[PDB]
């Protein structure tokens, strides 16, 4: 049967059907912390280069 297909689906739904501790809560907080920080630093960096070009 299409187990590999239902595999991604089970993992896509895992958050509500087979998730560990708050996997996406802890990952969404980490991603935002790392994405927000890198986006903020890249913005402050690109902004500084504008005045230091």
Describe this protein's structure:
The longest helix has 29 residues, at 23-51. This protein has one domain (1-53): Phospholamban (Single alpha-helices involved in coiled-coils or other helix-helix interfaces), CATH 1.20.5. It has helices at residues 3-17, 23-51. The chain is elongated, with a radius of gyration of 19 Å. The N and C termini lie far apart (59 Å). By secondary structure, the chain is mostly helical. The PDB classes it as signaling protein. Keywords: helix-turn-helix, signaling protein. It forms a monomeric assembly. Solution NMR structure of phospholamban in detergent micelles. The protein: Cardiac phospholamban.
End-to-end distance:
59 Å
Number of strands: 0
Q: Calculate Rg over CA atoms.
A: 19 Å
SSE series: HH
CATH topology call = Single alpha-helices involved in coiled-coils or other helix-helix interfaces
Overall form: elongated
CATH superfamily: Phospholamban
Strand content: under 5%
Helix segment count?
A: 2
Helical coverage, percent range: over 70%
Query: Architecture in CATH?
Result: Up-down Bundle
At the first level of CATH, the class is: Mainly Alpha
Q: How can the largest sheet be summarized?
A: none
List keywords for this structure.
53 residues; mainly alpha; Single alpha-helices involved in coiled-coils or other helix-helix interfaces; 83% helix; 0% strand; elongated; signaling protein; helix-turn-helix; monomeric
